[PDB]
Amino acid sequence: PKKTG
Amino acid sequence: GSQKERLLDELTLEGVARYMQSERCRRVICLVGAGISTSAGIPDFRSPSTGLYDNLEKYHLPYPEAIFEISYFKKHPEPFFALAKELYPGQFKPTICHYFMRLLKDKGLLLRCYTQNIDTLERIAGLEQEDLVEAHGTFYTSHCVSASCRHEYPLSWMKEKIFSEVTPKCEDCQSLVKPDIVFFGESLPARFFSCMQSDFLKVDLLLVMGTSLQVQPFASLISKAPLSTPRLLINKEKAGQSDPFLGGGMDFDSKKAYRDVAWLGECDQGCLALAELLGWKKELEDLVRREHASIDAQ
Ligand SMILES: *[C@H](CCCCCCCCCCCC)O[C@@H]1[C@H](O)[C@@H](COP(=O)(O)OP(=O)(O)OC[C@H]2O[C@@H](n3cnc4c(N)ncnc43)[C@H](O)[C@@H]2O)O[C@@H]1S
Ligand SMILES: [Zn+2]
Q: Are B143 and B152 in contact (CB under 8 A)?
A: yes
What's the residue count for chain B? Answer: 298
Q: Are residue B290 and residue B267 in the same domain, yes or no?
A: yes
Q: Are residue B215 and residue B252 in the same domain, yes or no?
A: yes
CA distance linking residue B145 with residue B142, whole number of Å: 9
Q: Are residue B183 and residue B286 in the same domain, yes or no?
A: no
Residue nearest ligand 1's atom 42 by CA: B35
Q: Are residue B210 and residue B274 in the same domain, yes or no?
A: yes
Q: What is the 3-state secondary structure (H, E, C) of chain B?
A: CCCCCCCCCCCCHHHHHHHHCCCCCCCEEEEECHHHCHHHCCCCCCCCCCCHHHCCHHHCCCCHHHHHEHHHHHHCCHHHHHHHHHHCCCCCCCCHHHHHHHHHHHCCCEEEEEECCCCCHHHHHCCCHHHEEECCEEEEEEEECCCCCCCEEEHHHHHHHHHHCCCCECCCCCCEEEEEECCECCECCHHHHHHHHHHCCCCCEEEEECCCCCCECHHHHHHHCCCCCCEEEEECCCCCECCCCCCCCECCCCCCCCCEEEEECCHHHHHHHHHHHHCCHHHHHHHHHHHHHHHHHC
Question: What is the distance of C-alpha B36 from the center of its chain?
Answer: 7
Residue A4: list chain B partners with CB under 8 A. Answer: 184-185, 215-217
Experimental method: X-ray
Q: Phi and psi of B250, rounded to 5°?
A: -65, 135
Q: Are residue B231 and residue B86 in the same domain, yes or no?
A: no
Q: Are residue B5 and residue B112 in the same domain, yes or no?
A: yes
Write the CATH number for B59.
3.30.1600.10
> Pick from B189, B205, B221: which residue ends a domain?
B189
Write the CATH number for B122.
3.40.50.1220
For residue B68, the enclosing domain spans 39-94+136-189
Q: How far is CA B259 from CA B16, B29, B235, in A?
A: 10, 15, 17
Resolution (A): 1.5
Dist. CA B37 → ligand 2 center (Å)? 32
Q: Are residue B101 and residue B62 in the same domain, yes or no?
A: no
Helix then strand then coil, in percent of chain A rounded to 5, is 0, 40, 60
Which of B211, B238, B272 best tests ligand 1's pocket when mutated (most atoms within 8 Å of CB)? B211
Q: Are residue B179 and residue B265 in the same domain, yes or no?
A: no
Q: Are residue B295 and residue B166 in the same domain, yes or no?
A: no
Torsion sign, CA atoms B174, B176, B177, B180: negative
B275 burial via Cβ count (<10 Å: 0-12, 13-18, 19+)? buried
Which of B76, B98, B136, B151 is catalytic? The answer is: B136
CA distance linking residue B34 with residue B198, whole number of Å: 25
Q: Are residue B143 and residue B231 in the same domain, yes or no?
A: no
Q: Are B246 and B271 in contact (CB under 8 A)?
A: no
Q: Are residue B43 and residue B30 in the same domain, yes or no?
A: no
Q: Are residue B178 and residue B215 in the same domain, yes or no?
A: no
Q: How many domains does chain B have?
A: 2
